[PDB]
Design a protein around this ligand. Structure first.
Ligand SMILES: Cc1c2c(c(O)c3c(O)cccc13)C(=O)[C@]1(O)C(=O)C(C(N)=O)=C(O)[C@@H](N(C)C)[C@@H]1C2
Ligand SMILES: [Cl-]
Ligand SMILES: [Cl-]
Ligand SMILES: [Cl-]
Ligand SMILES: [Cl-]
Ligand SMILES: [Cl-]
Ligand SMILES: [Cl-]
Ligand SMILES: [Cl-]
Ligand SMILES: [Cl-]
Ligand SMILES: [Cl-]
Ligand SMILES: [Mg+2]
Lengths: 203, 196
């Protein structure tokens, strides 16, 4: 079939959903695309190159709230961006692992620059603006990775559970992690706000 | 080698530091222990079982702040627990990845129950106490993972960002975010039913 970048990425993302990240291989991709492995090699040098491209393309295709809307508050921007990032990571099987194992594009660098510009224009020091954006990223990625790895582990004993843990596990299994995530996200943002507004005051 | 559980874990953690999580295999563990694979199999059924046990033993061995001190505030407890958790995850190569997606083990039940009960004793609902603990975990795991990954590895403002980001190992960003999280929890807890 067609082996332009877009078609190779489409096929690989579809394969990822079938195999997961550990099972994804260039050999299986060649099969999916109806080609011999040396043919694929011309287009895609190895699994690492493949994964780097997928990670970028997942965000490029699906992380559609990467920039603030005109006039949007920083609080709202971080909230929306976090929700968008989470959605994008959850869209594919092992998506967060795919994302984790890369380092950003030149395009992603521009976006981060704009986000950093935006934060600093809203009163954050560069340091605090960065730490905020980092913390949102770390929390969001951590939440998705726990969810997705937990799912992955299931494919491979209530009577002894103590009562609060039993109830906590019931609570956590009750959705895909969204409720816990959204609650933590508000706490994170409010913490940032308390810090920003303090300026040089002891807080 | 000796193949009691402790010796097997010892060997596997040593191997983990050598190979990382992806590179860790039962074949290489058997080699390290000077045994054949089917011998290892009697003791360790597969990689998932090994990883599950490593997750537990890393905390058992190195997570020293899992319970509040007598009289300790919930804020201080979460701070201390988060710092301890992070140190324990950082102790071994890919430690955060080893933890990911695990659930409390039987040997951790009393501890984790106490943590949950402790939050509720401080005014949190079980739900909100859980969400606080979970947020701390998720944030800490994210922070460590990004540190462990860019051990495994232009714009103006960004460029100074990378300077501060490379001025240390991640601890400053981590600690700053942890304080934000804790203050956010406090603001929520203290609001009760007030619009906040
Ligand atoms: C309460 C809880 C915890 C954890 C956890 O994974 C979990 C879960 O998967 C479902 C429901 C509840 C929990 C932790 O991993 C753990 O790291 C942990 O095992 C743990 C421990 N064993 O000491 C902690 O200290 C806790 N945290 C404050 C770092 C946290 C507690
Ligand atoms: Cl072609
Ligand atoms: Cl193309
Ligand atoms: Cl491959
Ligand atoms: Cl707004
Ligand atoms: Cl023995
Ligand atoms: Cl033993
Ligand atoms: Cl293996
Ligand atoms: Cl205290
Ligand atoms: Cl209780
Ligand atoms: Mg855990």
């Amino acid at each position: 079939s067609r082996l332009n970048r877009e078609s190779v990425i489409d096929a690989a993302l579809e394969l990822l959903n079938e195999t997961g990240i550990d099972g994804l291989t260039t050999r299986k991709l060649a099969q999916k695309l109806g080609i011999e492995q040396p043919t694929l090699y011309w287009h895609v040098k190895n699994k690492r190159a493949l994964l780097d491209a997928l990670a970028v393309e997942i965000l490029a295709r699906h992380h559609d709230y990467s920039l603030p809307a005109a006039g949007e508050s920083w609080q709202s921007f971080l909230r929306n961006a976090a929700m968008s990032f989470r959605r994008a990571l959850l869209r594919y099987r092992d998506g967060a692992k795919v994302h984790l194992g890369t380092r950003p594009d030149e395009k992603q660098y521009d976006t981060v620059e704009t986000q950093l510009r935006f934060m600093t224009e809203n009163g954050f020091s560069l340091r605090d603006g960065l730490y905020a954006i980092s913390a949102v990223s770390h929390f969001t990625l951590g939440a998705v990775l726990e969810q997705q790895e937990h799912t992955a582990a299931l494919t491979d004993p209530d009577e002894n559970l103590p009562p609060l843990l039993r109830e906590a596990l019931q609570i956590m299994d009750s959705d895909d992690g969204e409720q816990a995530f959204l609650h933590g996200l508000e706490s994170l943002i409010r913490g940032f706000e308390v810090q920003l507004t303090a300026l040089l005051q002891i807080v």
